[PDB]
Amino acid sequence: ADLIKKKLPFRTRSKFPRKSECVQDCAKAFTNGNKDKIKDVKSEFFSCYCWYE
Amino acid sequence: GSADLIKKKLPFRTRSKFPRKSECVQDCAKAFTNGNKDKIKDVKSEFFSCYCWYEA
Amino acid sequence: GSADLIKKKLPFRTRSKFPRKSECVQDCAKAFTNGNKDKIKDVKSEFFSCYCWYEA
Amino acid sequence: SADLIKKKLPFRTRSKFPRKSECVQDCAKAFTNGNKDKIKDVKSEFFSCYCWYEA
Amino acid sequence: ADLIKKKLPFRTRSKFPRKSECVQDCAKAFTNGNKDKIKDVKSEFFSCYCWYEA
Amino acid sequence: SADLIKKKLPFRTRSKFPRKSECVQDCAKAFTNGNKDKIKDVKSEFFSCYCWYEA
């Protein structure tokens, strides 16, 4: 229901991760690996922004 | 007759400098449609803000 | 069918100076198709106005 | 094994530079008995369109 | 199925064919007119490149 | 769903700059036993691709 924005708390493997990479890492970081609970992502320099419920 | 699609600016700040479409849908629903995201028909990102379009 | 797709200017001003597509679809449907947005086949934003394309 | 063929609209459009939807409508009127699903491609021209449909 | 890349073996009608024209002609040339098996096209001068499944 | 992995193609493509469909096919050949549905993303490179696939 409720959406929230967090920065990835660790580095990505890729310098510029694509959407699938950020979804994977965001789910790993915040939703116990549940990719379905990741609602939005944004690519950054060795990082992602994650929007999840 | 039909409803008007009406545009209102968000009455509070967003957390993000440029909120994404999902953030604007969420916050617009919080502000204007009792948290009902289904009633938010359009959004536009602004500086720590959004424009919200919903029917009235 | 044999219907033409016809282009008409909105017969009133929009609320927004540069209306977005959703605003133009809403206002075009109000003006010309009794609020049926599915019958609005195309729109074009203009200065406080829209062009509306629907079948006749 | 039909060819996709290009023909110019045989009458003028109402708009000077018709948009895609107008060209689909008029191309269908001209060449596919008003069936827009049979219009596979369009290109806007001066008071006209090019129409791509199967023959 | 297998993806194969071939140049169109005949000329297109259009000088620079659009994507729809290339899909039609690529299907005629390589997939017995089945456009679904045409996975990609690229327009060229009176020609196309065709990527299709076989 | 499964684990997503990013790898560069371990052999050369036929095309100098392969398009997305070519990269999907070759990435699947390299990494998913030819199952293209398991290729989640691709990126064209010089006679090569980067492949994002489910392992």
**Burial status of residue F20 (CB atoms within 10 A of its CB: 0-12, 13-18, 19 or more):** middle
**Inter-residue contact D25 to D36 (CB < 8 Å):** yes
Beta bridge partners of C51: C9, C44
Which residues of A are less than 8 Å from F52 in CB distance?
18, 20-21
**Inter-residue contact B18 to B47 (CB < 8 Å):** yes
Record: contact B44-C15, CB cut-off 8 A: no
End-to-end, the C-alpha distance of chain F in Å comes to: 10
**Angle made by CA atoms D32, D37, D40, in degrees to the nearest 5:** 80
- The CA distance from E14 to the nearest CA of chain F, in Å, is 23
CA-to-CA distance for E44 and F18, rounded, in angstroms? 16
Record: contact F4-A20, CB cut-off 8 A: yes
Beta bridge partners of A38: A52
Which residues of E are less than 8 Å from F15 in CB distance?
5
Q: Do chains B and E touch (3 or more CB pairs under 8 A)?
A: no
CA-to-CA distance for D8 and B12, rounded, in angstroms? 55
Residue of A4, A48, A51, A52 to mutate, interface with B, max B Cβ within 10 Å: A51
**Angle made by CA atoms B19, C23, C6, in degrees to the nearest 5:** 140
CA-to-CA distance for A8 and A28, rounded, in angstroms? 10
Q: Do chains A and F touch (3 or more CB pairs under 8 A)?
A: yes
Query: Which candidate, A20, C2, F44, places its Cα nearest to that of D36?
Result: C2
**Inter-residue contact E30 to E54 (CB < 8 Å):** yes
**Inter-residue contact D30 to D13 (CB < 8 Å):** no
